[PDB]
């Protein structure tokens, strides 16, 4: 039995940060009381087409009923160069530009 | 252009079941979440259910949880609502609705179907009783006489009323049906005519009840009081 | 749940007037509020989202504002195509709750009703029921007091009113008030009266009849 997607709004609490593994971490809060629900998170090449690239690493991206105002960290493996972190789906999704150095 | 063609009118007895369908065209059906929205006397305009593009997420307003199931077939571009244990308060016009942006959860709707009237009632099919509203001194003012027909106790909607087979149209008012306590509908149709014509001109209201394929023509006799 | 309300439920306005209608949420929904327009017999049409962003093809006389718990939709200069019902809808999170709707009607000058009363027909009495109909024809505005009296006794709970939509030619309303009594009760009384109060009338108008005098 799986959970439906989260339908409420996410916000970034701090600026995304690069890790030793070359991945990026993103700390978000969630305004909804529609939990338990599944956190949508992906990397995109551009903001208009939202073509998926890279991969989400966090294995349990789920908001629970007890989550409330606590903060969640998501970890993604972005492509080399420019891409966008996209948290959530639909009208209220949030994006942040990311650049991964190297080749 | 976007087209959302919904299935035909449905009449259900309390406790019964019903499946609504909505055939989509004019956009990439498999990339959009789809929703059902209803509008009726019991609940106003009310969101009912949403299903994501890939059917992985389904959402329901609390009053239909466990009774309604939403699904879709992306190979035929069709949306479904499976309604069971229907109650009288579920009576409404049910709308197919398309999400504005692709890959969403049904937040905003930029295209809608034409809607499907769903009536849930235990009343029996019954043609109306037509009673004259006869003109008299109690309905005349300044050479203007009011007359009409009382169209009482019928089910289901609608009835249409014409006067003199459509020859009389100016000054005709047919009120909206009211759901009576007994579960049957009732309305009146009235018209104002010159009181001098009450002696020479015949006035007949033509009541048609299409759901029963019946018709009643009632001649409204003027009163001598 | 977040309760969505709207104010007013109905208002009358004229072409060229500035019209503002209000939507409220019981707790904050931030900026995630949309507006729809609906004509009778049709589906709603999306007007505006994110409080103030116009949907494609919507004329620029529409605008929205507000934040959190209070929102407004404004029509700067009303046109005839704008007479309709307007709904707000929250989308901070599901359920995607619509407001109850505000109907924008055409304003015109007051017009007094013509009042007519109809005794029940003999055939209906044969079936055992007596319907007395009071007709208010071609009046404006809609609000009217229609008080039934049976041998002086004010009636309550045994009548139903029905009102037409605004007439396409003169923007007036018509109203029917139907008093429904059993045959036994109808024949235990003599005088039946419908008293109408309306701002177009300088004083209440009463139509009455005695049972069996027609």
Residue numbers in the entry:
A (entry chain E): 303 to 405
B (entry chain H): 1 to 52, 52A, 53 to 82, 82A, 82B, 82C, 83 to 100, 100A, ...
C (entry chain L): 1 to 214
Sentences from the paper on this structure:
To better understand ZIKV-116–mediated neutralization, we determined the x-ray crystal structure of ZIKV-116 antigen-binding fragments (Fab) in complex with ZIKV DIII (H/PF/2013) at 2.3 Å resolution. The total buried surface area at the antibody-antigen interface is 1,551 Å2, with a shape complementarity factor of 0.71. The heavy chain accounts for 67% of the interface, with a combined buried surface of 1,042 Å2 (542 Å2 on DIII and 500 Å2 on the heavy chain), and the light chain contributes the remaining buried surface area (264 Å2 on DIII and 245 Å2 on the light chain). Binding of ZIKV-116 to DIII is mediated by 11 direct hydrogen bonds and 9 water-mediated networks in addition to van der Waals contacts. The FG-loop has the most extensive contact network, forming five direct hydrogen bonds and four water-mediated hydrogen bonds with ZIKV-116. The N-terminal region of DIII contributes 35 contacts and forms 5 additional direct hydrogen bonds with residues from the CDR-L3 and CDR-H2 of ZIKV-116. We note that there are two complexes in the crystallographic asymmetric unit that adopt overall similar conformations, with a root mean square deviation of 1.19 Å over 332 Cα atoms of DIII and variable domains of ZIKV-116. However, presumably due to crystal packing, we observed a different conformation of the DIII CC′-loop in one complex where it is not engaged by ZIKV-116 CDR loops but rather by an adjacent Fab. In our structure, Glu393 is directly contacted by ZIKV-116 CDR-H3 and participates in an extensive hydrogen-bonding network, forming three direct hydrogen bonds and two water-mediated indirect hydrogen bonds with ZIKV-116.
E protein is the primary target of neutralizing antibodies and is composed of three ectodomains: domain I (DI), which links DII and DIII together; DII, which contains a fusion loop that mediates viral fusion with host endosomes; and DIII, which adopts an Ig-like fold that undergoes a substantial repositioning during viral fusion. Herein, we combine virological and biophysical assays to define the mechanistic basis for the neutralizing activity of ZIKV-116, a mAb derived from a donor infected by ZIKV in 2015 in Brazil. Functional studies in cell culture show that ZIKV-116 primarily inhibits infection at a post-cellular attachment step by blocking viral fusion with host membranes. X-ray crystallographic studies reveal that ZIKV-116 recognizes a DIII lateral ridge (LR) epitope, with one residue distinguishing binding and consequent neutralization of Asian versus African ZIKV strains.
